[PDB]
Symmetry: D2
Subunit: 257 residues, 4 copies
Amino acid sequence: EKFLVIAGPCAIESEELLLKVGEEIKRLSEKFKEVEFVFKSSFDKANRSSIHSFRGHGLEYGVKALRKVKEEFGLKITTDIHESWQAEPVAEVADIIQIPAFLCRQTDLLLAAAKTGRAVNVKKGQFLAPWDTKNVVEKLKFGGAKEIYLTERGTTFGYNNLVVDFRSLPIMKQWAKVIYDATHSVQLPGGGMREFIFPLIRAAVAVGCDGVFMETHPEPEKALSDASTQLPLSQLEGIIEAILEIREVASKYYETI
Amino acid sequence: KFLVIAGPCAIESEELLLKVGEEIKRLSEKFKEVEFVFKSSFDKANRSSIHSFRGHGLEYGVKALRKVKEEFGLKITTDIHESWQAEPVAEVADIIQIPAFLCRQTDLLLAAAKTGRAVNVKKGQFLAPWDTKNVVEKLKFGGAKEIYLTERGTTFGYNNLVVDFRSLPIMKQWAKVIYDATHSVQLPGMREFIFPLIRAAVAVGCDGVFMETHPEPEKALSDASTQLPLSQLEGIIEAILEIREVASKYYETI
Amino acid sequence: EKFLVIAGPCAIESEELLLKVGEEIKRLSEKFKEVEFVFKSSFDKANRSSIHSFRGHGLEYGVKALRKVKEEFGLKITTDIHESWQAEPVAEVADIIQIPAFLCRQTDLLLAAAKTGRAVNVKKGQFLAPWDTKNVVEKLKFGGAKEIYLTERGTTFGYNNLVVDFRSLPIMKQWAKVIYDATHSVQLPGGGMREFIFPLIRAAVAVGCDGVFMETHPEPEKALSDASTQLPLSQLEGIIEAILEIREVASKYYETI
Amino acid sequence: KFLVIAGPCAIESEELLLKVGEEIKRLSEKFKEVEFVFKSSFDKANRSSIHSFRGHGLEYGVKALRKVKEEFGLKITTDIHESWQAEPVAEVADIIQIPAFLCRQTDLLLAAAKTGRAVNVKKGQFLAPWDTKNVVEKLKFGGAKEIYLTERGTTFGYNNLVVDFRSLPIMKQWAKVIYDATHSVQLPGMREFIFPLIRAAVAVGCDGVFMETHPEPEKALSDASTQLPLSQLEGIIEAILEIREVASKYYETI
Ligand SMILES: O=P(O)(O)CNC[C@@H](O)[C@@H](O)[C@H](O)[C@H](O)COP(=O)(O)O
Ligand SMILES: O=P(O)(O)CNC[C@@H](O)[C@@H](O)[C@H](O)[C@H](O)COP(=O)(O)O
Ligand SMILES: O=P(O)(O)CNC[C@@H](O)[C@@H](O)[C@H](O)[C@H](O)COP(=O)(O)O
Ligand SMILES: O=P(O)(O)CNC[C@@H](O)[C@@H](O)[C@H](O)[C@H](O)COP(=O)(O)O
């Protein structure tokens, strides 16, 4: 099955930033033809820790910018919603509607996403056990979703720290396609360690998943969000090549569900 | 005055609310040194299963809660799940409650603060005590004046919550602190631990306790394993006041 | 039942230090006649993080110093053992033999302590669940122990942090008398916060336990071990008075096992 | 060379050790790029229950292990529990193993280091990765030259262990790192997770893997639910080498 690579800048800082990243993602999609690329960027960071942190330029601006990316590069699009009313307008451009980790149990949000007919990707809450994602998928199927993904992004481990329990990959695979979030899984909540992004992503593909999620920015140090975890854009190609190589050699050993 | 927030988990029917409201009204008359607030959710918007009880809708719920306030003169509190619900709920709710999973949703907090009502935020199971400072800052920025933070346990491995009582004195630095005695006891919960931990909370020091109570928990449509039998509420409240009276002498300053 | 207060300097820095603390504990035992005091101090810190940290002056010196405390003040004694061979000589002076938290599963150490005929107090390992202490007590009874205590001292919560799950008190009470370690439960492993010692001890007595364990030193800042958690000796009396008051008012509500 | 430490959890009988030793000897001949070390405990000194299998004693165990080394020419490793056992065990053990619960017992570490043998310390379930630096310092101070640190999971709530793979690159700063594939999967363990996590370990990068294996795990007197069937060992080793060959290109420097 075609491996999925979901990547893009954390927040839609500007349509210009999006087009710059989209250009590189498009180039990579032409090289790695065995990969299905999906361009990601949030029109709103609705859960920042501080009221003073950057959120975005609004849903309208964001959807317009994402539509530009899709129009100019022919790339699939994904973005997250925060309240039910956003599902409809976002579905006009998003191929995959993303459900934030803190909101993975909000029934109406999941239902709003599911009735759009678009694929839905739920980030597993830091509080949720792997086996409890079964009910999340059930809610989506109930709501009409036919293409469902579950994303591993770490679990609360003491205060201001997340651990990745890789046993979650084969467990969640029982009911949905599984994505590994390589950048948020190493973040330190309300404190991330970029030095662990690559080794953990190698672990994810060796264990076996259906795709990886990576936030990338031309200059992470200047990012308006997740400046400590976003991967420099120039490093994306090398990481993807490594992903595919490890996936290939490990693939014959992936257990059947 | 010490705050006691209590009532059935979900608004199973205004009838149920009236029966519980009657008992809470009685206790309110018996314990004048306590500020009672009637609580019940018009919607369980985050159930694990799609086939579980959610409720009868916001309108029916606000109506039922309105009936309790008018018939008993009790303050009211219920939780909201999306920003648009703040305004209509604020018509009856003296305290707007923010769900634990939603304690970081900026718009929900601002929407509640904008109503002019008091706001009680359930501390997320993923949040560290010191990180609630930013939560309070959002509400203040939103115009909130009366702010509460509720301790309801922290993720401890899978399907288990632990109460780190160090959080009480830490959160008290920036807001009044309430201890949720019913949801905090989640085991892979267990009613036998409710009273013991409530005693711990008041010995440590808090500004109030939150307790879900139902006439027949066994028949509750939500949190049946943790809702306190109505008949046991008076005894626990009296125990709370006695321990607090003695322990309060040792509560650390700010 | 007579409440137990186990207190003393963490390590036997000197026989002089022991006599100074013992003098104060003796004075308090004369005031709080409803309390059973047990003087504690380790002849060896056999598990320090660093090879360069203070350990002690040897078993011989330690037992001799403890015997002096008992002889001069008529106080019961408790100290911990680290290897089986130490049980016999330590039992010559110790009324209660303490089993370190990391060693709560070492069968031979528990058995060595149990056959001495002395009471045995096992510190619950930071890795052990409350319900799994049942087998620890079973091992001791099997080995001949007739007076057994289990001490709550925190549980691993992420890295370098311990949390106290107070549900452990009523759970462990099912099979042994329960002691709350007020000073080690707030320590930050390999990093304690002294500001939380008092509030958590208030919690322990409100929930209900059979005693409390508190390391105390005339000048904690100069202690050779646990300098960040040992309680100043001058504060001991006030803390004990508070303990008894809260215990009394909460006592009628203690659940039956 | 990549290290593979394997054998039955407990020395149920020298017969069992010979049967496993024969297979490990064969694999040793098949995979020349791998350094094999036969492992088995002469005593399970930390069983939860007093009524569980411990073993046949140190003398019988050292004798049985001696037989494996002499009949197959394989290196040996076993764990010690008290300081006095180091000397007699060092007569046969090329690597002295320190139990996880005992990784902070200074005298045990020094006793092992004093034998002149290599020392492998199982990282306590309570220890943070960075805190193993002090463990290595004790062994060096004790004269140890060849030192290993083994990842075997970390306490995650109750009756559950999680493997934080960030520990591999962190511990590598001060010692060779081994991944314990069998004990690391403790669930409220589960054999279905052994292979998946072993693959993760080699993709991340380690210096060896530790695997308990038994001809008939179902009949094992210890770790029956987690011991790898002997017949599956070859396949896993080959998988390990293939993934390592490809992934090693990306292992971070020191
Ligand atoms: O829903 P999630 O899986 O967290 C994913 N997406 C949103 C993230 O970009 C965001 O929540 C991320 O975890 C951020 O690291 C938190 O933000 P802050 O720096 O204000 O403390
Ligand atoms: O925000 P909170 O503190 O959880 C409070 N409000 C909602 C709770 O009453 C309750 O529904 C909670 O989610 C409970 O964890 C039990 O629900 P479920 O049966 O779906 O597994
Ligand atoms: O067995 P325990 O419950 O830990 C109890 N008694 C021994 C303690 O004094 C000691 O282990 C204590 O936890 C110390 O805080 C650890 O020492 P270091 O500062 O070297 O990192
Ligand atoms: O120090 P360690 O890494 O645990 C290794 N040595 C011992 C293990 O083989 C094993 O006995 C371990 O304690 C296991 O956790 C299972 O044992 P039990 O059946 O008593 O609950």
